[PDB]
């Protein structure tokens, strides 16, 4: 497992350290889209920082299944729910929260379980849409931090294959 960059922005170029994690705050309401990124291991983007995307640059045809892991570094007494949805390849971007529940989804509540594993069923290169939606607002007590950060991790599975070596 390695860390992706979901926080990629023009402003974060001066401070690359903030690129590792993306913020969640009490200001966000219910139904807003926290982060959305396509997963193609080869193309430039959030998947260029991981070791998988770099090894896929030396190869042309790759296919298999993937996995994405999230981590919650926030305070212990904080509670809330997060919607993790995956759109099948060839579909459309979900407009709101209710239209993303019909597809593949998992409910991530950091009040009890701190991490989950989202398995991308299939990928091919001859893409999918991973969106993070707000379910319940961030609940914080007094004295506790009002802003938390979530780090995204990813790793390839056993069925992932590669061939046709091409240098870059």
């Amino acid at each position: 497992e390695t860390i992706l960059e979901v926080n990629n922005l023009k402003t974060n170029e001066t401070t690359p350290m903030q690129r590792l994690c993306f913020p969640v705050s009490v200001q966000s309401k219910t139904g807003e889209l926290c982060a959305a990124f396509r997963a193609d291991p080869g193309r430039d983007g959030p998947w260029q920082s991981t070791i998988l995307g770099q090894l896929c640059r030396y190869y042309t045809q790759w296919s298999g299944s993937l996995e994405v892991t999230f981590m919650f570094a926030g305070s212990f007494m904080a509670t809330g729910k997060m919607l993790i949805a995956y759109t099948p390849p060839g579909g459309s971007v979900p407009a709101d929260r209710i239209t993303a529940m019909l597809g593949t989804h998992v409910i991530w509540d950091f009040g009890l379980q701190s991490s989950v594993t989202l398995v991308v069923p299939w990928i091919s290169n001859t893409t999918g849409i991973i969106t993070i939606w707000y379910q319940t607002n961030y609940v914080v007590p007094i004295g506790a931090p009002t802003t938390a950060y979530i780090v995204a991790l990813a790793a390839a599975q056993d069925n992932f294959t590669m061939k046709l070596c091409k240098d870059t």
């Binding site: 007494m77 509670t79 809330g80 379910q135 007590p141 007094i142 506790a144």
Partner: protein, 170 residues
Amino acid sequence: ANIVIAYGEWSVNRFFTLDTKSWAKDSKGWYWKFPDVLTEVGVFGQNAQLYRSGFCVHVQCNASKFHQGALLVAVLPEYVLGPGQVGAVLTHPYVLDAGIPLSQLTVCPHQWINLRTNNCATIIVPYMNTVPFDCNFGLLVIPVVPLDFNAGATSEIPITVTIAPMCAEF
């Protein structure tokens, strides 16, 4: 073993998640009318336009240990007053806009939601009607104790309702 069975006896299969209501200090209450509110949700969206199904509902509230309050969830067969995923808001939570007092609401199957020792509750209810194949029953969630918290904390406590239909015959 907090499972509450109503009246002592028991791609379509999946968990439907409704909207999360913002529950504040000055609020009153919300109610959903099954099946009608669920007919626009997911696979049932194009299905509703006879039905025989049992309903398993989950009511979960995410709140820290610094807050206080209590809710009441109940299942009332054929609840008629005297609606979309947004539901509605009771303007008179004492009579529940039925002219029926709130103190006797516990005759129907219910489970107490107390922000102290329990963060979730569920009620399993079967289908009850005179005609087996047909506004069957409403879901009443109203706070008994209002919310009170010190300044600087989160003023909104989300309340989610997930519907899991079991034994569905269409």
